[PDB]
């Protein structure tokens, strides 16, 4: 429950007191060591909970390659690596009735609105364009094959196991375990 | 009037340190440090690999090494002179 | 998978002679993917960011209906049933202008966010074409390392890519030379590199250590030993020599 | 105060821009986590850097 | 209020443009500095070394 306070663009003499280029920092204790950034303060200054400390951040470790005019390094083994990448594809399709929002069910308000011309039609057209764009996005990402392919019933691929990404027949959703976890983790 | 400017998180000296690390990595180890551990290799051998990349054999580089190095050095010097002599070079950042 | 090892510059025998180890590494990596997804909550923050931004925009739009914008009240029914048309007209004009301005701001921000989402979806379509339907040579486009393959998974309003790559490991130092001098001729490797452990000279492929005897089948000759800087003397074996010897 | 929450919206948009700038710089320049150094003797076969 | 809204909308448009430029720069740093590119005219005129 400990906190520190930063006052921006203020000198420390008009308000564990530290004067940075971002402002005046109260509640943090300044150290001469350098770590990776945890909470960015600014101008190269970061803060961390170790009490609360403020430090200049390090860019990384130091490494010097043993360069020579006749030396080489060759790998003798390898590693297989698997990594993830998440990308958003679409938004939710939302429609707004201009007259209902702006006037409700009153008629006098609508008669007065008719003096503003064609604003509501413009707004409706813009939202409709967004709504069709979303479906276009999903088509362009996912419908890249015109044949539905299935995997053979005997899963003999030379020792490689794909059960965590292939559909689960037990579930009613016919989703893979990883897809189940992904759909459960987003609220 | 309520206007203020915030400082950037990375200072200019830290960006310069990043670029110097990239230069040192590519000069001492080629493209290996970008895909795993950095593996040292002599620079003419790396340039021979790069000639192989575009469809020219290695002996072409090994038999014209001094001429190629001189051409490279002259090109870098002309880059420096051209930047120093033309004002409209950095128009995009100024815009 | 042997074809894909060829695609990154490694021979097929390297895959066929290590098939079980590679399969086990693959299976362990997929298992770790599942564990990491199950144990880390902030992994899917991008989709959650999109949802949160849209929801808070709608909440702000609905909340704006409680403002009076300089009129007597924010309720149309009360202001109509409390006043005559001559002044109700002015007050209703105030309300109408305020609500129209709020609606226009909402629509403008929605258009800008839609443009950003469209750029992201174009990137995802390019990745589905070039990492799932092929093997990519571009650096860091389909993961960190040398790209082998990729697998897609679907997520709410999004896509997840599992990138499988090759990473070198356990490197070792050797002495190297640009060419070999033999019989007053200069020899260069066809597809590898000359290496020396201190005593003997071999030729390896460049991404995996597998030394061979230097023969006339894995080298080619060009010029004499006078021009190249750093050439080394060593013998180049002739595979046809012992054949006619007997 | 009768106009509602316009000012909060404007501040939120400007804060989003300010965060995006630092994200841009990180994505361009911070592509290595090792700091590499060149050897003290600069002998690269005739190439001058 | 109208003046402030105009300023903020213009800033949002410009920020989108700058973000696109920075994404291009990040792709170039990955593919021309950390590797050798086969794409025509992506890392200069000629055959990229």
Swiss-Prot record, chain D:
It comes from the Viruses. Glycans are attached at residue 48. Precursor of the fusion protein processed in the biosynthesis of the S protein and the formation of virus particle. Mediates fusion of the virion and cellular membranes by functioning as a class I viral fusion protein. Contains two viral fusion peptides that are unmasked after cleavage. The S2/S2' cleavage occurs during virus entry at the cell membrane by host TMPRSS2 or during endocytosis by host CSTL. This is Spike protein S2. It comes from Severe acute respiratory syndrome coronavirus 2 (2019-nCoV). The gene is S.
UniProtKB/Swiss-Prot annotation, chain E:
It comes from the Viruses. Disulfide bonds join 32-43. Changing residue 27 to I: In strain: Gamma/P.1. Subunit of the fusion protein that is processed upon entry into the host cell. Mediates fusion of the virion and cellular membranes by functioning as a class I viral fusion protein. Contains a viral fusion peptide that is unmasked after S2 cleavage. This cleavage can occur at the cell membrane by host TMPRSS2 or during endocytosis by host CSTL. In either case, this triggers an extensive and irreversible conformational change that leads to fusion of the viral envelope with the cellular cytoplasmic membrane, releasing viral genomic RNA into the host cell cytoplasm. This is Spike protein S2'. The chain holds residues 1001 to 1049 of 1273 of the full protein.
